[PDB]
PDB file of C-alpha atoms in Angstrom:
ATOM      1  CA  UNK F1015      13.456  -3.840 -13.760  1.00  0.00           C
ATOM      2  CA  UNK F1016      14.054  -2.840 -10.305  1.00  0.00           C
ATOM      3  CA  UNK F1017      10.830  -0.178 -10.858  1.00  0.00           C
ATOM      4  CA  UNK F1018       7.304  -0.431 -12.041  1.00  0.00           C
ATOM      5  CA  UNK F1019       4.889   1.762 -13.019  1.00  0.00           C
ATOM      6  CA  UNK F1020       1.450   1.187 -11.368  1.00  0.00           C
ATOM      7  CA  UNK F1021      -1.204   3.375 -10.965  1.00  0.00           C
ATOM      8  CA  UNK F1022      -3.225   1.953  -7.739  1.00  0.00           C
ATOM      9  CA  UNK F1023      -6.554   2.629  -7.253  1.00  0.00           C
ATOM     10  CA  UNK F1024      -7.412   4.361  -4.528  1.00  0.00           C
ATOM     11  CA  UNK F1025     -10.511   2.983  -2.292  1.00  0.00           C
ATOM     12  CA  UNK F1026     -12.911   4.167   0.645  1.00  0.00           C
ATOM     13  CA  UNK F1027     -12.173   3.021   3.649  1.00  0.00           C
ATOM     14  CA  UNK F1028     -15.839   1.255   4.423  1.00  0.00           C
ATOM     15  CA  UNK F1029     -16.009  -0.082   1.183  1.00  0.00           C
ATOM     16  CA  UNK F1030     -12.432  -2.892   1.306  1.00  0.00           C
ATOM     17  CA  UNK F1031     -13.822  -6.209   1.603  1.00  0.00           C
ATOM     18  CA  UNK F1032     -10.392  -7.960   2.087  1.00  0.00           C
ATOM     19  CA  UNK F1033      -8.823  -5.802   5.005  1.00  0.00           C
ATOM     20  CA  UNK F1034      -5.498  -6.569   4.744  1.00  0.00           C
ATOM     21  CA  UNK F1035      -2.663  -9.034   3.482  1.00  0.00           C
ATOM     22  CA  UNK F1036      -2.541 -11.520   6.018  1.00  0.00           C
ATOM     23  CA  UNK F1037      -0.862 -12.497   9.276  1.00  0.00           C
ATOM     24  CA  UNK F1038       2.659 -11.908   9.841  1.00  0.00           C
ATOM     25  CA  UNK F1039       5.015  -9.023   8.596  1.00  0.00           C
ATOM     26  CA  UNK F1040       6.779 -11.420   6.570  1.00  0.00           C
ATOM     27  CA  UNK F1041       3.482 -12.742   4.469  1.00  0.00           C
ATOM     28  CA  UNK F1042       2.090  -8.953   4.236  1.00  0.00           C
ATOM     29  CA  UNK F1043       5.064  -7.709   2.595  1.00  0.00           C
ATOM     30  CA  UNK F1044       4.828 -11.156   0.224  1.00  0.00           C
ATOM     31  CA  UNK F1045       1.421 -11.011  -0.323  1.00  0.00           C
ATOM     32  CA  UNK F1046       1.598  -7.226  -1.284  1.00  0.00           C
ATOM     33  CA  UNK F1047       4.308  -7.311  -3.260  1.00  0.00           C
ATOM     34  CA  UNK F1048       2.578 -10.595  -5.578  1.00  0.00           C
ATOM     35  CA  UNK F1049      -0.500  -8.280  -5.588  1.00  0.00           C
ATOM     36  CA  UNK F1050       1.367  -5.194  -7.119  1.00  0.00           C
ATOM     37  CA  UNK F1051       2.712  -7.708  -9.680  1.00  0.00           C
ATOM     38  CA  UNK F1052      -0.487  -8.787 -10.347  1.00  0.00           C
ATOM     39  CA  UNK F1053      -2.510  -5.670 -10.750  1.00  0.00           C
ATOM     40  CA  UNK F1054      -4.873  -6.028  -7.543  1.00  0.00           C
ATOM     41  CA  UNK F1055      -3.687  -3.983  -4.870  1.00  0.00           C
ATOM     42  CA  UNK F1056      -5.608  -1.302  -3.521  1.00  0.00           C
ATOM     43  CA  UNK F1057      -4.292   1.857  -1.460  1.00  0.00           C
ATOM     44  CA  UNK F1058      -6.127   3.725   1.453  1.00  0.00           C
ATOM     45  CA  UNK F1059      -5.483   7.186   2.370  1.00  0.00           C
ATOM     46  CA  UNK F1060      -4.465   6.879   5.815  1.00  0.00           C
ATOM     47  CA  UNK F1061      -6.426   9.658   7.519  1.00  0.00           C
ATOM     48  CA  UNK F1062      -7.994   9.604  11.776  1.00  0.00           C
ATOM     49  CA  UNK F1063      -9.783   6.237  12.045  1.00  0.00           C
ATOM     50  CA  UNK F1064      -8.965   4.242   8.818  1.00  0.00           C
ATOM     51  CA  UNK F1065      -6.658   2.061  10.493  1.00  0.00           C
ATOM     52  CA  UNK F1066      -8.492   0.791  13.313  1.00  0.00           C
ATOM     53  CA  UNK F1067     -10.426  -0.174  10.179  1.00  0.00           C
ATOM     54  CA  UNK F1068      -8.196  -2.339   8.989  1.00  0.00           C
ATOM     55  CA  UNK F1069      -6.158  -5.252   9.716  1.00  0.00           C
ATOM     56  CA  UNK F1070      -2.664  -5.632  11.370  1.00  0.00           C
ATOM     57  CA  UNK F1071       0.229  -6.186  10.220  1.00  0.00           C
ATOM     58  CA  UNK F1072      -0.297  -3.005   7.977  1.00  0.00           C
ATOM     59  CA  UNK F1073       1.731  -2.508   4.626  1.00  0.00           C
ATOM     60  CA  UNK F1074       2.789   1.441   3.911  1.00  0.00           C
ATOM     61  CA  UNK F1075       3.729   2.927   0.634  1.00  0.00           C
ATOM     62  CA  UNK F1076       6.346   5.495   1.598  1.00  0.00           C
ATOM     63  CA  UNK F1077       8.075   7.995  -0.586  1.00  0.00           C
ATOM     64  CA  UNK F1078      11.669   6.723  -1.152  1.00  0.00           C
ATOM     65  CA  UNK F1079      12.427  10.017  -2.884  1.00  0.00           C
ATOM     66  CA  UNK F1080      11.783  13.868  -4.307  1.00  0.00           C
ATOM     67  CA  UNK F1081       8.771  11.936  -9.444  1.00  0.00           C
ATOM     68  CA  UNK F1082       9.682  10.371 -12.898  1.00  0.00           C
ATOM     69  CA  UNK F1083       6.424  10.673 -15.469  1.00  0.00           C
ATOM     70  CA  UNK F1084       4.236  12.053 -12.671  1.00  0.00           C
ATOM     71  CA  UNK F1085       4.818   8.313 -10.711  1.00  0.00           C
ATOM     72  CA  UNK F1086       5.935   9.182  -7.181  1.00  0.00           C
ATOM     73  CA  UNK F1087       9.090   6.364  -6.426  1.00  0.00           C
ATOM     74  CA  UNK F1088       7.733   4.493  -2.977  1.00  0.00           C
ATOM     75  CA  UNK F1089       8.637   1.386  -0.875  1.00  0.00           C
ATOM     76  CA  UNK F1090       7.003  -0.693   1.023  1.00  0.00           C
ATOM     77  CA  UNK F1091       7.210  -0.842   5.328  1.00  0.00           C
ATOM     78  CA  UNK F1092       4.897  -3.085   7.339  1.00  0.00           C
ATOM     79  CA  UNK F1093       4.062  -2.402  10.647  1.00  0.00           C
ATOM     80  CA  UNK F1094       2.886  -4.816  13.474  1.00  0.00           C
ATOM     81  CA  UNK F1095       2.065  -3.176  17.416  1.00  0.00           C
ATOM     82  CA  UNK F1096       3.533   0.076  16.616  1.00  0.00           C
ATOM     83  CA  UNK F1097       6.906  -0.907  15.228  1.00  0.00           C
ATOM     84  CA  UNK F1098       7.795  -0.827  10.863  1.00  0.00           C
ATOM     85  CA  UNK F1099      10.195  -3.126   9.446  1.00  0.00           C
ATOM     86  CA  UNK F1100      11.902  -0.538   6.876  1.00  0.00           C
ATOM     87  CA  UNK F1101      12.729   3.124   6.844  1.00  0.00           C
ATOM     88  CA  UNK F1102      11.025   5.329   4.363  1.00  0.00           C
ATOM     89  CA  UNK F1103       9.572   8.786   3.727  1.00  0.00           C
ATOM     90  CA  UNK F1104       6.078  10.146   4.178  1.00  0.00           C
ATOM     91  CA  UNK F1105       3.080   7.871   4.045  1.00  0.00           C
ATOM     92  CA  UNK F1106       1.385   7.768   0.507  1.00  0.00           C
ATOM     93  CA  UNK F1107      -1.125   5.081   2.216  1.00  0.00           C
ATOM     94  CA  UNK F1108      -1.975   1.553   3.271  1.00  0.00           C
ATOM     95  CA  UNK F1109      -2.102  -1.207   0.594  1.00  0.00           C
ATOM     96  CA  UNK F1110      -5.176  -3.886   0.969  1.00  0.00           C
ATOM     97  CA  UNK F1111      -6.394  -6.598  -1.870  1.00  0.00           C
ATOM     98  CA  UNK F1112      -8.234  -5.249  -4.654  1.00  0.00           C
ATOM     99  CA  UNK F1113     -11.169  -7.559  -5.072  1.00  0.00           C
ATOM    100  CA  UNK F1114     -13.517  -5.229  -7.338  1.00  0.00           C
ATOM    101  CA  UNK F1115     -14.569  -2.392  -5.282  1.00  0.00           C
ATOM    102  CA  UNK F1116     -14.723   1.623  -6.850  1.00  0.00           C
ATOM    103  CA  UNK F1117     -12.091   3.609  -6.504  1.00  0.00           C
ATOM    104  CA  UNK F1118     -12.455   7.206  -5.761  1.00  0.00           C
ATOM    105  CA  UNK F1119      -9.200   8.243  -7.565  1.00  0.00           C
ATOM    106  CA  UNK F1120      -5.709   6.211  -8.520  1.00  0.00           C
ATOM    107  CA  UNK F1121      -2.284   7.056  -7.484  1.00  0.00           C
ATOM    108  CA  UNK F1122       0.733   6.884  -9.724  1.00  0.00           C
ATOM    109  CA  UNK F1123       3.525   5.250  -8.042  1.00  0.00           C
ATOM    110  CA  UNK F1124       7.003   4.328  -9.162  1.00  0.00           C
ATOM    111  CA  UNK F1125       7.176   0.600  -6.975  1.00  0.00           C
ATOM    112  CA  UNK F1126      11.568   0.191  -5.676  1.00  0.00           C
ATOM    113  CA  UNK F1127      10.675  -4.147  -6.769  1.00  0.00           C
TER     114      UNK F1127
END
């Protein structure tokens, strides 16, 4: 299918343990793509001072359109020193690993795989 269905938790900030998906655009977008897949990505609600929080390169969910069973459609853009490999809509959040932590809330997505 060239869309999933995932509902992502949706974590604090101060409580990620693993702050990010590695070390180059290309592995991000890898890495958060197999973690989709695999159930254990987490999303961050980019608000004034998460992302200092976390690491570089970043990996966006964007809106890729205007909401099939409630799941907002979204694709991924990294972003390394201020420029984003991919065009998108507005900013849903930042994806990090899920390793465990409590989410505050989860987001229904519609994932463009």
């Amino acid at each position: 299918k060239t869309h999933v269905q995932l509902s992502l938790p949706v974590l604090q900030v101060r409580d990620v343990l693993v702050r990010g998906f590695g070390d180059s655009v290309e592995e991000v977008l890898s890495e958060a793509r197999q973690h989709l897949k695999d159930g254990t990505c987490g999303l961050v609600e980019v608000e004034k001072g998460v992302l200092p929080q976390l690491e570089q390169p970043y990996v966006f969910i964007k809106r890729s359109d205007a909401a099939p069973h409630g799941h907002v459609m979204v694709e991924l853009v990294a972003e390394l020193e201020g420029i984003q490999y991919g065009r998108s809509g507005e900013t849903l959040g930042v994806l990090v690993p899920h390793v465990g932590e409590i989410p505050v809330a989860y987001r229904k997505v519609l994932l463009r795989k």
